[PDB]
Design a protein around this nucleic acid. Structure first.
Ligand SMILES: [Mg+2]
Ligand SMILES: [Mg+2]
Ligand SMILES: [Mg+2]
Ligand SMILES: [Mg+2]
Ligand SMILES: [Mg+2]
Ligand SMILES: [Mg+2]
Ligand SMILES: [Mg+2]
Ligand SMILES: [Mg+2]
Ligand SMILES: [Mg+2]
Lengths: 147, 187, 125, 128, 51, 225, 51
RNA sequence: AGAGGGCGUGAAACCGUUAAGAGGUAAACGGGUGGGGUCCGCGCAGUCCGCCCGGUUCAACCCGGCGGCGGGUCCGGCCGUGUCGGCGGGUCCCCCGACCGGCGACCGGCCGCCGCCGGGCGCAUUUCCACCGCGGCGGUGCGCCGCGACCGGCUCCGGGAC
RNA sequence: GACGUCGGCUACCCACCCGACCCGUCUUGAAACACGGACCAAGGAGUCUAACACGUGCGCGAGUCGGGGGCUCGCACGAAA
RNA sequence: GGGAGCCCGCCCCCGGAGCCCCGCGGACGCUACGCCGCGACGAGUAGGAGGGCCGCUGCGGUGAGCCUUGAAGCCUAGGGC
């Protein structure tokens, strides 16, 4: 809504809010990102460190499908299964240890962040980390690798 | 002729909510009466937090509220939140709590009612505890938003850990001259 | 809720009157024709309305039944008073005061009835 | 023998002359409507001695007698008899104003109703 | 779960019949004039031809 | 029930009236004692002077502990240090008066702003007229006229100040609670000096008005109050 | 003026449902219907449901 | 045609004439008055009303009818919130009983009250019109004014006493 | 005091006393022997798209979403919903 | 509640105590985005912010709105805010 904008309040003012000493010219400093090395160097060096220069190796034909590996933490692992499955745990006096498949929910890598409740689980994943496996073994479960 | 600076004479604090919704206005009127009449400062704090904006009342997680209520002494007290109570999925055991909040998520509401707790609104709080006796006032993390990671000492400054405004993070977008000791210098 | 409906109706009513610094509400059962929460015949559970009779003599007292809303055809009860300009005021006062039916509007209804009785009289020379 | 108002206090005005625009007398294209001077070198803008006065908040009229007619009432524009009946409970403090677009056929009815309800009309015998 | 009364249906000539329907819970939903105004103003622009 | 409540209310009213009467009697007694004390001090000074003058000796009077400072020039072209001292003395507008307790630090502060102020040693009548005619108390950061002893009591009861006589005693005879009593008083809004001035821009010694006018400040107070 | 002005505006589905529910609830409360100017004086019941 | 063939409405710059005023420091402008015109609002006094008090019927009080208000023994049922019972058909429904929030979600009777209508109530009560009281109250006076007392803030004057 | 008398602050004209240099702009500095300007009418200059950052309001909330597509209308309101 | 005081009992309710406080109900005041009381303060270019019942055009609702017994537009030494 142009009604609520600033241009309506500037009617009658000569400079239109751009000063009368230094007028509003086309491009006093240049167009775009001009002058990153000269006359605009301080802004680039104090707000965008590492802008200039080249680092690392090139990868000509990079495909994101190969590097696709979603991760899930042990902090939220029972959320992938229904709540009644977790309710049917520490119960039945058998040690059921229901199987949790993370590839079904859309995860390949299992990370060890978070606290795992004291209940045996069967976790099947493409990859495992050392801490996650340690937590699962300490709780009383087992890690299963799936291709 | 008196020499007094007028640059800091008008205080900027809010006097009324900027929202136009009418239920918040009714709650504001009720707590205006309660704060201006009752000597309790709890009503004053509730009024001021009702005047606040969305970012000034961040949501309170279920786990944080449970942990705060876990402290000794504050047993059997009503939780008072001026923000929104949000469900926390990485916690399993939820005790029974009495909570007062403007908004409660459907998952959080279901989990609280399942455990046997009570959920109340501020108009019910006024009827139950007009002076706010036996209540614990809580709030969410004010610095929880991602904007504060960009605030503070500017990036590219020694002993600064501020996230710069980058279009996309990657190998060849940053971390070069200005950040590499091999490329010019680093801070 | 009277307050909830007032919050909706306080500014976007069809009876509201702007134009030259005076605000009015021409809704029925609203004495003083004032856009006020107290003087609002649509939102309140109990309302008192005094209007001139259709014949041209006497006044009509309208009170909201309050037994059941959502039924506007039966919500309001109309009673006409046609007496000697002094028993009418006493009748209205006993309608409002002794019945405890919205005592805030007692004197307002009395003054409105007096004005209505004054109106239905010979005008001037 | 008109209808006297409820209260008729003494109305005091800080200023009664109109605020004229600077150099409105010198040119025809410059109208009497006030415009705030904004020139860098303007005698009126920086309040030189013996120049055109500029409107200020100080000239504000007293709130008791603001918008009050010399009789003691306040104008209220009325377009029909139904709108005239609104002023029944404000007759001693407000007076009805008949719109210019109202035809003479309905103006007499409005005047008669106002006389019945004892409301002053600032233009009772307007068109006939 | 607010108190939802029973609404009586009416025949073609008035004279409400014996059938009654309980008030649906939608009529007990909160009234938000600001939300209605926002949605209406933003939605009324979608049936507009370019010029 | 009604009769008992009415009797209780009447008894409460009578008790409040008795308390007010006792407070009035206390104020009267304190004022009489202050009159006696002022007379005793004034007579004692003359006694000591005569006692010293009887023999071949001299009696040096005490350095005054109270001073009254009046700002006698405007707010244009003021040095930063001078304006800082002036605003630390609650003297921001021209022709404003205040009471200053005299010590080494205050004497040096007054020395800094000599061209901007005219000060001296006030009398009992001067402080009486200043506190009575132009006495305003700072209550809730608001300038409230001292039209009743209730305001003075509400402000300085914890310091034993319950009437204007106590304020005059604390100001003229600077005591332990001089700071609170003086800060309670709003800075005096004095009018322009009737009869004109001698010379604003130079010191009182050389015929001007600025500087120390130890005994002549009373004339300025009379012509300004 | 250009034809590629942002003529159309977008509203969340949940907010649209909220607004329609608020309007449906406001269809009750004869005070609000009267405030809209509808001549509802003689209607036997404001939630007017017919066979 | 006060629409007359580039003809609906017909502004400003500019021009002619008529009426009035004025005119040797170019004209013009701001503040304050005065004089003259233009009409406006009175008035053939405008002394302005609105209450209380003094000098043709019904209120008071009964009978009948009608409608409404509030109440509790919840008097009875519905309605309705939380728990307990019958598992009777994770979430969504049925029956009685108990407690409690009996929450404006409705009735049928009881009580008290209010209003209206119809009958009485014939005249020290009751109510309209007009007057002599300016008697008590409130806002005002058509315009020009004057006087008294009280207060607030100032400029002075005359005395006495330390 | 009331049939040629009243009230009309503002506007019509005139007179008197005081004040009073032509506006806009560059400029440390403008009444300037600095520039533009006979007068009047009409038009006339911070917009739109896209990308960001912050603040604010709303809905949902560890989730959120409608891009595009599909099912209902023959388009009056609809190329909507 | 008991024991008692400078023969016992009452020592009562506002549908009436009649009021400078009435805890029994409460404006002429309550468009609570409303109303009311206290104090201090008031310069302004560049620039920033707020309020406009300031003004123009068109669209959705609403004034049982206005109008050939006269709309817009235009002129006015008329009355005002
Ligand atoms: Mg032009
Ligand atoms: Mg300049
Ligand atoms: Mg100087
Ligand atoms: Mg023509
Ligand atoms: Mg240049
Ligand atoms: Mg130069
Ligand atoms: Mg210039
Ligand atoms: Mg030229
Ligand atoms: Mg133009």
């Amino acid at each position: 809504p142009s009604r609520l904008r600033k241009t309506r309040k500037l009617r009658g003012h000569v400079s239109h809010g751009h000063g009368r000493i230094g007028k509003h010219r086309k491009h006093p400093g240049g167009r775009g990102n001009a002058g990153g090395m000269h006359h605009h160097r301080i802004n680039f060096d104090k707000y965008h460190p590492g802008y200039f220069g080249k680092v690392g190796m090139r990868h000509y034909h990079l495909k994101r499908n190969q590097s696709f590996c979603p991760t899930v933490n042990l902090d939220k692992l029972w959320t992938l299964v229904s709540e009644q499955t977790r309710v049917n745990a520490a119960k039945n006096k058998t040690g059921a240890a229901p199987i949790i498949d993370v590839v079904r929910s859309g995860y390949y890598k299992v990370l060890g962040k978070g606290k795992l409740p004291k209940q045996p689980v069967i976790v099947k994943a493409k990859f495992f980390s050392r801490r996650a496996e340690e937590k699962i073994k300490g709780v009383g479960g087992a890690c299963v690798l799936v291709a | 002729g008196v020499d007094i600076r007028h640059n800091k004479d008008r205080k900027v604090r809010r006097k009324e909510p900027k929202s136009q919704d009418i239920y918040l206005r009714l709650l504001v009127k009720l707590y205006r009466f309660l704060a201006r009449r009752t000597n309790s400062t709890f009503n004053q704090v509730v009024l001021k937090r009702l005047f606040m904006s969305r970012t000034n009342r961040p949501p309170l997680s279920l786990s944080r509220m449970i942990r705060k209520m876990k402290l000794p002494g504050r047993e059997g007290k009503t939780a008072v939140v001026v923000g929104t109570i949000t469900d926390d999925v990485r916690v399993q055991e939820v005790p029974k709590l009495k909570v007062c909040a403007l908004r409660v998520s459907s998952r959080a509401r279901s989990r609280i009612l399942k455990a046997g707790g009570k959920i109340l609104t501020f108009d019910q709080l006024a009827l139950d505890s007009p002076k706010g006796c036996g209540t614990v006032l809580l709030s969410g993390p004010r610095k929880g938003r991602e904007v504060y990671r960009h605030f503070g000492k500017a990036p590219g400054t020694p002993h600064s850990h501020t996230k710069p405004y980058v279009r996309s993070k990657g190998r060849k977008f940053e971390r070069a001259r200005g950040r590499r000791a091999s490329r010019g210098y680093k801070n | 809720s009277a307050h909830l409906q007032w919050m909706v109706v306080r500014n976007c009513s069809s009876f509201l009157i702007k134009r030259n610094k005076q605000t009015y509400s021409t809704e029925p059962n609203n004495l003083k024709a004032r856009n006020s929460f107290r003087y609002n015949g649509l939102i309140h559970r109990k309302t008192v309305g005094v209007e001139p009779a259709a014949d041209g003599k006497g006044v009509v007292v309208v009170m909201k039944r309050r037994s059941g809303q959502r039924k506007p055809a039966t919500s309001y009860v109309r009673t006409t008073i046609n007496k000697n300009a002094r028993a009418t005021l006493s009748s209205i006062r006993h309608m409002i005061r002794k019945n405890k039916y919205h005592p805030d509007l007692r004197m307002a209804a009395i003054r409105r009835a007096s004005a209505i009785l004054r109106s239905q009289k010979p005008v001037m020379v | 023998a008109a209808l006297r108002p409820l209260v008729k206090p003494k109305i005091v005005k800080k200023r009664t002359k109109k605020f004229i625009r600077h150099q409105s007398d010198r040119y025809v294209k410059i109208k009497r409507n006030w415009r705030k001077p904004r020139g860098i070198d303007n005698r009126v803008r920086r309040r030189f001695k013996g120049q055109i006065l500029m409107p200020n908040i100080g000239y504000g009229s007293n709130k008791k007698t603001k918008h009050m007619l010399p009789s003691g009432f306040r104008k209220f524009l009325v377009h029909n008899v139904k709108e005239l009946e609104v002023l029944l409970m404000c007759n001693k403090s407000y007076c009805a104003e008949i719109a210019h677009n109202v035809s003479s056929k309905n103006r007499k009815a409005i005047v008669e109703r106002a006389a019945q309800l004892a409301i002053r009309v600032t233009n009772p015998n307007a068109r006939l | 779960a607010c108190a939802r009364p029973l609404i009586s249906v009416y025949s073609e000539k008035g004279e409400s019949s014996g059938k009654n329907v309980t008030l649906p819970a939608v009529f007990k939903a909160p009234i938000r004039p600001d939300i209605v105004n926002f949605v209406h103003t933003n939605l009324r622009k979608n049936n507009r031809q370019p010029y | 029930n009604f009769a008992e409540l009415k009797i209780k209310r009447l008894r409460k009213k009578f008790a409040q009236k008795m308390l007010r009467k006792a407070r009035r009697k206390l104020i009267y007694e304190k004022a009489k004692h202050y009159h006696k004390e002022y007379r005793q001090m004034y007579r004692t000074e003359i006694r000591m002077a005569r006692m010293a003058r009887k023999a071949g000796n001299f009696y040096v009077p005490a350095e005054p502990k109270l001073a009254f400072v009046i700002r006698i020039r405007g707010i244009n072209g003021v040095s930063p240090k001078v304006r800082k001292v002036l605003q630390l003395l609650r003297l921001r507008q021209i022709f404003n008066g205040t009471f200053v307790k005299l010590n080494k630090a205050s004497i040096n502060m007054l020395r800094i702003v000599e061209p901007y102020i005219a000060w001296g040693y006030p009398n009992l009548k001067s402080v009486n007229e200043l506190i009575y005619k132009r006495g305003y108390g700072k209550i809730n950061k608001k300038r409230i006229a001292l039209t009743d002893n209730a305001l003075i009591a509400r402000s300085l009861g914890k310091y034993g100040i319950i009437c204007m006589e106590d304020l005059i005693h604390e100001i003229y005879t600077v005591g332990k609670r001089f700071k609170e009593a003086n800060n309670f008083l709003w800075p005096f809004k004095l009018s322009s000096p009737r009869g004109g001035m001698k010379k604003k821009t130079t010191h009182f010694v050389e015929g001007e008005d600025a500087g120390n006018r130890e005994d002549q400040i009373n004339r300025l107070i009379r012509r300004m109050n | 003026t250009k034809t590629w002005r942002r003529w159309h505006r977008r509203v969340n589905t949940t907010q649209k449902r909220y607004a329609i529910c608020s309007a449906l609830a406001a269809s009750a409360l004869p005070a609000l219907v009267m405030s809209k100017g509808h001549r509802i004086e003689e209607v036997p019941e404001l939630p007017l449901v017919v066979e």
